[PDB]
């Protein structure tokens, strides 16, 4: 009934609110995508384009919520780049053990950080794992978490090591399914990391629109922005 | 000076529970990992548990997992061990320890004794080991006291209120099949002093609040 | 578990002589951070343990410089360059590279001295204990070196089994000897059925096994 271009006009305000709160680079990407939806000849184009807005915007608010840097996909570091710059003395071995699984070197998580020392820096990795584990324990939110560990080694108090934090996030209906497949994907490289004596933590989580607005991995004020924009776009897309 | 001071030991029935504490002083407790180590009588040292400075990392020896909990209270410079489902194999001196900079045991407390047993607390029977020609050699006679069937362990023995120290041998107790302990204490003195010097063994068993003073005379 | 194997089990050494104690690990103790968490402790009799050496070769602050440690991987050594009397006790290695943290089983450092045959004394039961229905006979081996000794009980020349217990002191700090008690426990009825109560001691300081005995009546 409603043409799609007309559908975008109606939600001009909610989408304006959305672009204004997103980080700068995330905002512009969502603004290009929005015009692709307005100028969409087919309802499959519009849908696929709206799927990208749902994920990209959500990531922008995940960055804001956690005070991490939003990284456009084009500029996201892979694992190989992380090992090379952060652990340069192990990269050659990191290349040898990936001879049979070369896709590992090209794994690109949503966030690839390291403890303060294009890998982003964070002051404490253990605190990020705790905050994830806390909310999982408190609101029943499904996560998966893994830590590399050479042999059965103990943590130590007389020296500091470099370490990575690998985080995957998502906005999609099958929350359980997302974290299981994410952790299955990274399990191989965790084991590789144990064998190279590199400390990594892998975290994965997801939200969906049925998640109570106080319980998401993003601030509730951002939950409201997504529900009032990207979620009404999807509902109006199907009906008309 | 760094000091660690354990408390909370005592007697527990099998299956029972018990919480130990370790008060720490002389260093910034909250910046360091803390540990528990134990030692069953006449055996070697056995690591129990580690807890990181901010309590985020905890490790347990396999033989205590699911029964023991380690925790700390940093504002009160205190380390805790909660023991549950205790077994007689948990009988040991328990020590808290820290590396004060690492995971090695650089500083140790004096330890607290935990006895896991259903035996009833019991003061000792104290019998003389009287001097005779069967216990004399040259100008020396041996004599002593048999300290039989006490529980739990801690028992002290002195002679003449601690004035007699030369030649004293107080033997380690033996855990009997009854669940009680027994030891003897002996001393060699000049045979010329038999008949003129009085010899009393002073047996102190605090767990039962019993003190025995036994005079040992030739028969 | 990491298994740590110490050798020797006991080390008799003369004052002033060097001592060497070995600790072998079932797997490498090199941690991925580059450190090697093998440490040495001394436990003196009746005291809590004390740290001597941490991470292979670092002497703990205040420890006498006669103590040193070396090794790498799975093979480590504690050396006492010149033993003193206060070094009597049990030496332990331990590792904290892997969880669980584990200890070696201990090496007992014993101070060498000249042979000293035991003085053997026997004590019949006290009348007071007999009044109660039991009879403990005590046999005392006093002030002997070295520790190896054999003590058996005979009652009218019949060897006794299952009714005696034995206790040994730690090595004495003044004269480096040992003392040993052996206690035979009979019922009062069984005790009053027999005449000769005998303690038979074997020690290398004795020219032949010594039987120390009394007759119940006397
Ligand atoms: O990094 C991701 C990614 C996410 O992280 C995500 O959670 C969902 C999905 N993703 N995918 C994104 C993506 C990202 C955001 C919103 C929707 C989509 S939908 C599939 C698709 C993506 C990128 C380009 C493209 F042509 C796609 F068809 C791909 C999965 O392969 C690694 C890159 N990547
Ligand atoms: Mn991604
Ligand atoms: Mn994602």
XYZ file of C-alpha atoms and ligand atoms in Angstrom:
713
model
C 0.000 0.000 0.000
C 2.697 2.461 1.070
C 5.587 2.902 -1.373
C 8.949 2.381 0.437
C 10.208 5.893 -0.273
C 7.009 6.967 1.396
C 7.734 4.578 4.294
C 11.084 6.279 4.893
C 9.455 9.712 4.887
C 7.034 8.816 7.710
C 9.905 7.676 9.993
C 12.003 10.745 9.141
C 12.088 11.871 12.786
C 12.918 8.501 14.465
C 15.687 7.905 11.907
C 16.950 11.484 12.423
C 17.137 10.787 16.141
C 19.048 7.590 15.312
C 21.703 9.204 13.113
C 22.254 11.953 15.697
C 23.209 9.626 18.560
C 25.380 7.166 16.643
C 29.155 7.737 16.535
C 30.263 9.883 13.592
C 31.494 7.186 11.209
C 28.652 4.849 12.155
C 26.159 7.704 11.634
C 27.313 8.424 8.081
C 27.275 4.732 7.147
C 23.713 4.365 8.409
C 22.785 7.521 6.468
C 24.065 6.115 3.177
C 22.217 2.853 3.879
C 18.998 4.743 4.655
C 19.067 6.462 1.262
C 19.582 3.089 -0.437
C 16.353 1.986 1.247
C 14.473 5.117 0.151
C 15.794 4.639 -3.402
C 15.151 0.864 -3.443
C 13.399 -0.443 -6.581
C 12.821 -3.936 -5.028
C 11.462 -5.007 -1.566
C 14.392 -7.470 -1.347
C 16.853 -4.648 -1.824
C 15.121 -2.643 0.914
C 15.091 -5.617 3.290
C 18.760 -6.534 2.810
C 19.707 -2.862 3.167
C 17.672 -2.580 6.368
C 19.393 -5.693 7.738
C 22.700 -3.861 7.421
C 21.338 -0.802 9.244
C 20.134 -2.983 12.112
C 23.591 -4.452 12.671
C 25.702 -1.371 11.953
C 23.635 0.928 14.166
C 23.563 -1.637 16.987
C 27.346 -1.903 16.865
C 27.594 1.886 17.060
C 25.596 1.884 20.281
C 27.601 -1.049 21.623
C 30.713 1.085 21.110
C 29.090 4.060 22.844
C 27.775 1.959 25.729
C 31.223 0.506 26.394
C 33.308 3.610 25.533
C 35.118 1.627 22.861
C 36.006 2.995 19.439
C 33.531 2.178 16.692
C 35.476 0.664 13.785
C 33.950 0.503 10.279
C 34.251 -3.050 8.875
C 36.714 -1.790 6.239
C 39.072 -0.642 8.994
C 38.659 -3.581 11.394
C 41.880 -5.505 12.166
C 42.040 -9.228 11.558
C 43.657 -11.706 13.938
C 46.765 -11.837 11.750
C 47.247 -8.083 12.041
C 46.731 -8.308 15.793
C 49.324 -11.048 16.278
C 51.768 -9.239 13.991
C 51.748 -5.893 15.792
C 51.038 -6.969 19.392
C 53.100 -10.199 19.413
C 55.674 -9.642 16.636
C 58.049 -12.281 18.064
C 55.448 -15.040 17.585
C 53.965 -14.101 14.166
C 56.181 -16.478 12.141
C 55.004 -19.345 14.401
C 51.537 -17.887 14.147
C 51.948 -18.301 10.377
C 53.241 -21.929 10.544
C 50.407 -23.355 12.734
C 47.814 -21.710 10.485
C 49.102 -23.500 7.374
C 46.116 -25.887 7.447
C 43.587 -23.268 8.716
C 44.621 -20.069 6.854
C 41.186 -18.478 7.377
C 42.215 -17.960 11.028
C 44.632 -15.214 9.982
C 41.704 -13.383 8.354
C 39.215 -13.657 11.238
C 37.802 -10.184 11.881
C 35.939 -9.818 15.201
C 33.703 -6.872 15.970
C 36.271 -5.624 18.506
C 39.911 -6.709 18.593
C 41.509 -5.034 21.598
C 44.576 -5.593 23.748
C 45.447 -4.532 27.265
C 47.020 -1.077 27.307
C 50.591 -1.225 26.034
C 44.953 -1.228 14.477
C 44.336 -3.069 17.795
C 42.375 -0.830 20.166
C 43.571 -0.573 23.763
C 41.657 -1.174 26.985
C 42.817 -0.624 30.543
C 41.725 -4.037 31.825
C 40.536 -7.068 29.885
C 39.548 -9.023 33.004
C 37.114 -6.234 33.940
C 35.347 -6.485 30.560
C 35.005 -10.285 31.028
C 33.600 -9.751 34.570
C 31.017 -7.148 33.388
C 29.933 -9.581 30.664
C 29.866 -12.519 33.100
C 27.993 -10.395 35.673
C 25.122 -9.410 33.366
C 24.940 -12.958 32.024
C 24.618 -14.200 35.599
C 22.135 -11.432 36.607
C 19.682 -11.067 33.675
C 20.042 -14.548 32.206
C 21.622 -13.161 29.011
C 23.381 -15.890 26.953
C 27.097 -15.389 26.401
C 29.973 -17.617 25.465
C 33.444 -16.982 26.806
C 36.822 -18.597 26.291
C 40.341 -17.912 27.533
C 43.491 -19.337 26.009
C 45.619 -21.189 28.494
C 48.998 -22.840 27.801
C 49.031 -26.311 29.375
C 47.604 -25.781 32.886
C 49.550 -22.589 33.567
C 48.826 -20.327 36.533
C 48.465 -16.573 36.422
C 51.499 -14.786 37.853
C 52.092 -11.652 39.935
C 55.744 -10.813 39.188
C 55.533 -9.923 35.465
C 52.999 -8.493 33.019
C 52.155 -10.100 29.677
C 50.365 -8.772 26.640
C 46.893 -10.158 26.030
C 44.018 -9.776 23.578
C 40.284 -9.391 23.981
C 38.137 -10.577 21.082
C 34.478 -9.541 21.196
C 31.597 -10.457 18.876
C 28.218 -8.742 19.232
C 24.960 -8.939 17.362
C 21.357 -7.794 16.961
C 19.319 -10.758 15.714
C 16.498 -13.017 16.772
C 18.425 -16.269 17.375
C 20.494 -15.015 20.301
C 21.360 -18.521 21.535
C 22.322 -19.556 18.007
C 24.595 -16.557 17.503
C 26.791 -17.098 20.559
C 27.139 -20.843 19.959
C 28.313 -20.467 16.353
C 30.568 -17.531 17.278
C 32.339 -19.474 20.022
C 32.591 -22.572 17.802
C 34.283 -20.466 15.134
C 36.881 -19.025 17.540
C 37.532 -22.241 19.500
C 40.181 -23.302 16.987
C 42.174 -20.111 17.314
C 41.903 -20.127 21.127
C 43.592 -23.572 21.074
C 46.173 -22.203 18.612
C 46.694 -19.332 21.025
C 47.253 -21.730 23.935
C 49.926 -23.468 21.870
C 51.729 -20.187 21.075
C 51.646 -19.056 24.717
C 49.468 -16.051 23.844
C 46.744 -14.964 26.272
C 43.425 -14.202 24.591
C 39.847 -13.948 25.799
C 36.936 -14.420 23.386
C 33.484 -13.020 24.265
C 30.295 -13.237 22.233
C 26.807 -11.899 22.964
C 23.599 -10.884 21.215
C 20.350 -8.974 21.713
C 16.990 -9.136 19.980
C 13.915 -6.902 19.965
C 12.148 -9.115 22.536
C 14.918 -8.487 25.091
C 13.514 -6.386 27.981
C 14.627 -2.751 27.255
C 16.529 -2.623 30.553
C 18.528 -5.798 29.841
C 20.327 -5.217 26.538
C 24.046 -5.045 25.926
C 23.463 -1.358 25.062
C 22.075 1.492 27.137
C 18.280 1.577 27.276
C 18.325 5.068 25.754
C 19.855 3.442 22.659
C 17.411 0.512 22.760
C 14.603 3.071 22.442
C 16.321 4.652 19.427
C 16.557 1.330 17.562
C 13.024 0.235 18.423
C 11.567 3.547 17.257
C 13.486 3.599 13.971
C 14.948 0.386 12.533
C 12.232 -1.821 14.041
C 9.271 0.145 12.640
C 10.983 0.184 9.253
C 10.963 -3.624 9.273
C 7.308 -3.837 10.323
C 6.157 -1.349 7.672
C 8.314 -3.104 5.067
C 6.539 -6.454 5.498
C 2.945 -5.231 5.651
C 3.034 -2.923 2.623
C 57.616 -6.818 59.467
C 55.338 -9.110 57.463
C 53.268 -11.414 59.657
C 50.487 -13.900 58.913
C 48.388 -15.223 61.794
C 45.929 -18.105 61.361
C 43.064 -18.961 63.689
C 39.943 -21.085 63.682
C 41.452 -24.524 64.150
C 40.004 -27.131 66.421
C 38.087 -30.373 66.363
C 35.431 -31.214 63.730
C 33.332 -34.333 63.291
C 33.584 -36.018 59.874
C 31.161 -34.341 57.525
C 31.408 -31.217 59.680
C 32.396 -27.723 58.625
C 34.917 -25.144 59.811
C 36.109 -21.662 58.784
C 39.748 -20.567 59.160
C 40.989 -16.992 59.157
C 44.361 -15.443 58.447
C 45.086 -11.911 59.695
C 47.795 -10.172 57.647
C 49.992 -7.220 58.641
C 53.136 -5.359 57.604
C 52.377 -5.095 53.884
C 49.572 -3.905 51.627
C 47.504 -7.107 51.774
C 45.043 -6.051 49.065
C 47.713 -5.958 46.332
C 48.808 -9.600 46.613
C 47.533 -13.086 46.063
C 47.079 -15.244 49.135
C 47.281 -18.999 49.623
C 46.501 -21.892 51.938
C 48.893 -24.852 52.409
C 48.471 -27.808 54.751
C 50.565 -30.595 56.244
C 49.146 -33.828 57.652
C 51.176 -34.916 60.737
C 54.567 -36.553 59.853
C 53.867 -35.876 56.122
C 54.879 -33.344 53.477
C 53.354 -30.054 52.409
C 50.189 -29.981 50.303
C 48.936 -26.905 48.488
C 45.239 -26.140 49.164
C 44.088 -22.978 47.375
C 45.129 -19.640 45.877
C 43.121 -16.406 45.602
C 44.203 -13.419 43.525
C 44.523 -9.897 44.935
C 41.091 -8.814 43.702
C 39.534 -12.291 44.169
C 38.949 -12.671 40.412
C 41.129 -15.785 40.077
C 40.751 -18.730 42.427
C 42.478 -22.121 42.191
C 41.846 -25.269 44.265
C 43.714 -28.516 44.819
C 41.659 -31.335 43.318
C 41.179 -33.000 46.711
C 39.260 -29.962 48.087
C 37.255 -28.825 45.014
C 33.552 -28.503 45.794
C 34.174 -28.691 49.557
C 36.494 -25.768 50.360
C 35.964 -22.092 49.533
C 38.714 -19.507 49.734
C 37.826 -15.841 50.119
C 39.265 -12.614 51.431
C 38.232 -9.273 52.886
C 40.716 -6.673 51.707
C 39.569 -3.750 53.921
C 40.045 -6.044 56.946
C 43.403 -7.578 55.863
C 41.919 -11.022 56.381
C 42.002 -14.227 54.350
C 39.434 -16.986 54.768
C 39.109 -20.715 54.149
C 35.614 -22.256 54.470
C 35.860 -26.035 54.886
C 32.800 -28.290 54.499
C 32.221 -32.046 54.163
C 35.422 -32.631 56.126
C 37.095 -36.051 56.113
C 39.706 -37.524 58.426
C 42.205 -37.078 55.590
C 41.771 -33.305 55.999
C 43.434 -33.457 59.450
C 46.454 -31.163 59.108
C 48.262 -28.036 60.155
C 46.821 -25.309 57.894
C 49.074 -22.410 56.892
C 48.257 -19.237 55.056
C 51.030 -17.911 52.902
C 51.839 -15.260 50.328
C 54.592 -14.517 47.863
C 54.403 -10.764 48.456
C 55.178 -10.324 44.776
C 54.696 -13.775 43.251
C 53.056 -17.198 43.467
C 55.833 -18.685 45.581
C 55.383 -19.040 49.354
C 57.644 -16.279 50.659
C 55.813 -15.614 53.967
C 54.084 -18.200 56.159
C 51.973 -18.132 59.297
C 52.564 -20.347 62.312
C 49.620 -22.521 61.279
C 46.449 -23.746 62.929
C 45.681 -27.411 63.632
C 42.444 -28.933 62.320
C 41.548 -32.434 63.531
C 38.704 -34.225 61.731
C 37.533 -37.115 63.888
C 34.539 -38.374 65.831
C 36.621 -39.346 68.861
C 35.656 -37.584 72.074
C 38.005 -35.101 73.715
C 39.761 -36.928 76.529
C 42.494 -36.033 78.983
C 45.459 -38.368 79.281
C 46.157 -41.081 81.789
C 49.653 -40.399 83.085
C 51.712 -43.271 84.458
C 55.268 -43.200 85.839
C 58.182 -44.918 84.144
C 60.057 -45.510 87.373
C 63.866 -45.556 87.630
C 65.398 -48.934 88.415
C 68.549 -50.939 87.739
C 66.957 -51.996 84.441
C 67.128 -48.293 83.449
C 70.542 -47.350 84.908
C 73.851 -47.083 83.073
C 77.049 -46.129 84.893
C 76.203 -43.059 86.941
C 72.965 -42.278 85.048
C 69.360 -43.416 85.437
C 66.491 -42.933 82.990
C 62.892 -42.306 84.082
C 59.806 -40.850 82.478
C 56.036 -40.681 82.093
C 53.675 -42.611 79.846
C 50.983 -40.229 78.568
C 48.244 -42.604 77.441
C 45.029 -42.124 75.467
C 44.346 -38.431 75.034
C 42.452 -36.539 72.271
C 42.725 -34.325 70.347
C 46.486 -34.018 69.778
C 48.024 -30.904 71.387
C 49.714 -32.144 74.664
C 52.713 -30.497 76.354
C 55.113 -32.197 78.745
C 57.685 -30.571 80.989
C 59.716 -31.788 83.955
C 59.809 -30.045 87.344
C 57.842 -27.128 85.886
C 60.394 -26.746 83.075
C 63.466 -26.522 85.345
C 64.739 -29.912 84.174
C 65.591 -29.684 80.477
C 68.891 -31.490 80.018
C 68.474 -35.034 78.722
C 64.710 -34.720 78.124
C 63.227 -36.626 75.198
C 59.496 -36.236 74.549
C 58.423 -38.586 71.808
C 55.966 -37.764 69.027
C 52.499 -39.109 69.684
C 51.174 -42.188 67.903
C 47.594 -42.206 66.638
C 46.214 -45.434 68.049
C 43.627 -47.603 66.299
C 41.159 -46.481 68.992
C 41.323 -42.899 67.671
C 43.257 -41.662 70.738
C 46.907 -40.614 70.958
C 49.711 -41.772 73.254
C 53.287 -40.729 73.910
C 55.969 -41.062 76.516
C 58.489 -38.564 77.821
C 61.771 -39.593 79.404
C 64.772 -37.996 81.067
C 68.185 -39.184 82.205
C 69.470 -37.763 85.482
C 72.376 -38.707 87.796
C 71.631 -41.886 89.724
C 73.161 -40.120 92.749
C 70.169 -37.755 92.663
C 67.577 -40.545 93.053
C 66.412 -40.383 96.655
C 67.318 -36.698 97.023
C 65.800 -34.945 93.981
C 62.087 -35.087 93.281
C 61.021 -35.637 89.666
C 57.573 -34.545 88.481
C 56.349 -34.606 84.892
C 53.874 -31.788 84.155
C 51.351 -32.901 81.518
C 49.148 -30.211 79.974
C 46.292 -31.099 77.621
C 44.491 -27.830 76.863
C 41.768 -29.284 74.543
C 40.322 -31.067 77.592
C 41.415 -28.442 80.167
C 43.335 -31.136 82.074
C 46.698 -30.790 83.851
C 48.425 -33.763 85.468
C 51.501 -33.495 87.683
C 52.951 -36.957 88.244
C 55.838 -37.584 90.614
C 58.139 -40.356 89.396
C 59.910 -42.253 92.215
C 61.959 -45.460 92.426
C 59.724 -48.417 93.214
C 49.538 -32.808 37.949
C 53.176 -31.747 37.777
C 55.114 -34.355 39.743
C 58.272 -33.195 41.524
C 60.796 -35.911 42.500
C 63.480 -35.062 45.065
C 66.659 -37.023 45.595
C 68.103 -38.180 47.882
C 65.321 -38.957 50.389
C 67.719 -38.284 53.272
C 71.125 -36.646 53.213
C 73.602 -37.233 56.036
C 76.328 -34.574 55.804
C 79.191 -33.477 58.057
C 79.285 -29.948 59.433
C 81.302 -27.778 57.059
C 80.685 -30.043 54.052
C 78.682 -29.150 50.952
C 75.227 -30.621 50.329
C 73.373 -31.036 47.012
C 69.656 -31.799 46.658
C 67.958 -32.586 43.349
C 64.409 -31.795 42.249
C 63.133 -33.235 38.948
C 59.865 -32.193 37.298
C 57.587 -34.434 35.233
C 57.134 -31.584 32.733
C 58.972 -28.367 32.007
C 58.451 -25.587 34.542
C 59.272 -22.819 32.048
C 56.181 -20.616 32.034
C 55.014 -18.987 28.813
C 55.868 -15.585 30.332
C 59.536 -16.618 30.322
C 59.907 -17.296 34.046
C 60.474 -20.647 35.760
C 58.565 -20.992 39.022
C 60.589 -23.546 40.958
C 61.298 -22.667 44.586
C 63.072 -24.152 47.588
C 61.949 -24.240 51.220
C 63.403 -25.443 54.502
C 61.214 -26.728 57.345
C 63.074 -27.000 60.629
C 61.550 -29.461 63.132
C 58.507 -28.009 64.859
C 58.513 -24.805 62.724
C 56.557 -23.622 59.713
C 58.403 -23.736 56.371
C 60.754 -20.907 55.264
C 61.540 -19.827 51.693
C 65.141 -20.163 50.620
C 65.173 -19.746 46.816
C 62.455 -18.521 44.448
C 62.410 -18.910 40.654
C 65.322 -21.407 40.427
C 68.168 -19.225 41.688
C 66.972 -16.033 43.467
C 68.000 -16.131 47.113
C 65.171 -14.818 49.284
C 66.162 -11.629 51.059
C 67.883 -12.420 54.368
C 68.678 -16.071 53.608
C 72.364 -16.918 54.279
C 74.501 -16.957 51.167
C 75.576 -20.572 51.694
C 72.243 -21.448 49.990
C 72.021 -21.366 46.187
C 69.817 -22.851 43.479
C 70.312 -23.715 39.835
C 68.844 -25.592 36.887
C 66.311 -25.182 34.118
C 63.472 -27.018 32.417
C 62.908 -30.164 34.459
C 66.185 -30.430 36.439
C 66.992 -28.264 39.445
C 69.511 -28.306 42.285
C 69.744 -26.764 45.732
C 73.285 -26.529 47.116
C 74.426 -25.747 50.637
C 78.055 -24.748 50.214
C 79.009 -25.333 53.852
C 76.474 -27.009 56.129
C 75.778 -25.622 59.599
C 74.015 -27.205 62.563
C 70.949 -24.990 62.114
C 70.448 -26.426 58.591
C 68.977 -29.623 60.068
C 65.467 -30.172 58.717
C 63.405 -31.062 55.653
C 64.080 -29.358 52.311
C 61.205 -29.094 49.809
C 61.035 -27.927 46.235
C 57.752 -26.586 44.878
C 56.472 -25.254 41.563
C 53.897 -22.568 40.760
C 54.127 -22.566 36.952
C 51.051 -24.820 36.589
C 47.877 -25.431 38.598
C 47.800 -27.344 40.936
C 50.871 -25.995 42.663
C 52.807 -29.018 43.844
C 55.615 -29.893 46.237
C 58.360 -32.433 46.102
C 58.239 -35.028 48.813
C 61.075 -33.595 50.904
C 64.748 -34.371 51.578
C 65.707 -34.802 55.245
C 69.105 -33.230 55.899
C 70.744 -35.170 58.726
C 73.891 -34.031 60.557
C 76.655 -36.663 60.583
C 78.296 -37.593 63.867
C 80.295 -40.532 65.131
C 78.514 -43.820 65.780
C 76.774 -43.949 69.173
C 75.283 -47.226 70.339
C 71.935 -46.861 72.141
C 71.580 -47.227 75.850
C 68.702 -49.692 76.221
C 66.382 -49.338 79.211
C 63.139 -51.199 79.958
C 60.222 -50.087 82.175
C 57.673 -52.610 83.547
C 54.072 -51.350 83.746
C 53.142 -49.196 86.692
C 50.938 -50.685 89.372
C 48.560 -47.786 88.731
C 48.097 -48.762 85.076
C 47.797 -52.445 86.017
C 44.983 -51.567 88.454
C 43.041 -50.393 85.376
C 43.327 -53.603 83.316
C 46.147 -52.840 80.870
C 49.929 -53.227 80.988
C 52.285 -51.135 78.875
C 55.936 -52.193 78.862
C 58.239 -49.443 77.599
C 61.613 -50.100 75.951
C 63.853 -47.073 75.483
C 66.761 -46.718 73.045
C 68.526 -43.537 74.138
C 70.977 -41.274 72.326
C 72.030 -43.404 69.354
C 73.420 -42.713 65.835
C 72.757 -43.581 63.025
C 68.986 -43.882 63.027
C 68.679 -47.454 61.682
C 67.695 -49.753 64.535
C 65.552 -52.849 65.016
C 63.486 -53.406 68.175
C 61.427 -56.521 68.859
C 59.545 -57.804 71.892
C 59.591 -61.290 73.328
C 57.487 -62.635 76.156
C 58.780 -65.942 77.544
C 60.854 -66.095 74.339
C 57.818 -65.815 72.017
C 58.049 -63.038 69.454
C 55.243 -60.474 69.693
C 53.341 -59.022 66.758
C 50.381 -56.678 66.491
C 50.636 -55.347 70.069
C 53.491 -52.806 70.028
C 54.130 -49.338 68.639
C 57.286 -47.320 68.169
C 58.203 -43.632 68.141
C 61.442 -41.860 67.167
C 62.537 -38.362 68.068
C 63.875 -35.949 65.498
C 67.649 -35.647 65.391
C 68.820 -33.780 68.491
C 70.121 -30.270 67.842
C 72.897 -30.460 70.473
C 74.452 -33.920 70.023
C 72.808 -35.103 66.758
C 71.576 -38.398 68.230
C 68.173 -40.081 68.039
C 66.099 -41.666 70.764
C 63.413 -44.287 70.287
C 60.645 -45.746 72.424
C 58.850 -49.035 71.828
C 55.708 -49.716 73.831
C 54.251 -53.193 74.265
C 50.610 -53.157 75.387
C 49.028 -56.296 76.850
C 45.872 -56.920 78.779
C 46.444 -57.261 82.515
C 45.361 -60.900 82.400
C 47.804 -61.741 79.593
C 50.555 -59.828 81.412
C 50.179 -61.776 84.641
C 50.369 -65.105 82.750
C 54.035 -64.614 81.808
C 57.390 -64.191 83.520
C 60.099 -62.828 81.188
C 59.580 -59.563 79.281
C 62.384 -58.856 76.818
C 63.340 -56.042 74.476
C 65.828 -57.086 71.754
C 67.766 -54.249 70.100
C 69.955 -54.396 66.981
C 72.143 -51.430 66.045
C 75.459 -51.204 64.202
C 77.031 -49.523 67.254
C 76.448 -52.746 69.203
C 78.775 -55.723 68.940
C 75.679 -57.972 68.797
C 71.916 -57.639 69.405
C 71.140 -56.684 73.016
C 68.240 -58.284 74.880
C 67.041 -56.197 77.826
C 64.622 -58.059 80.070
C 62.928 -58.223 83.460
C 60.925 -60.850 85.356
C 57.382 -59.749 86.232
C 57.623 -60.804 89.877
C 60.914 -59.005 90.522
O 31.302 -8.999 10.752
C 30.355 -9.459 10.133
C 28.937 -9.487 10.678
C 28.609 -9.203 12.006
O 29.496 -9.021 12.869
C 27.242 -9.516 12.488
O 27.030 -9.636 13.706
C 26.302 -9.989 11.594
C 26.693 -10.264 10.293
N 27.901 -9.906 9.810
N 28.132 -9.990 8.414
C 27.935 -8.620 7.816
C 26.770 -7.838 8.356
C 27.109 -6.798 9.215
C 26.134 -5.998 9.779
C 24.795 -6.222 9.494
C 24.435 -7.252 8.642
C 25.405 -8.063 8.070
S 24.756 -9.266 7.060
C 25.959 -10.209 6.179
C 26.971 -9.270 5.555
C 27.875 -8.548 6.326
C 28.791 -7.700 5.695
C 28.805 -7.571 4.317
C 27.899 -8.304 3.565
F 27.894 -8.202 2.230
C 26.994 -9.145 4.176
F 26.131 -9.839 3.416
C 29.490 -10.459 8.053
C 29.697 -11.955 8.254
O 31.030 -12.310 7.852
C 32.095 -11.484 8.346
C 31.789 -10.005 8.158
N 30.537 -9.876 8.878
Mn 31.504 -8.299 12.608
Mn 28.618 -8.813 15.019
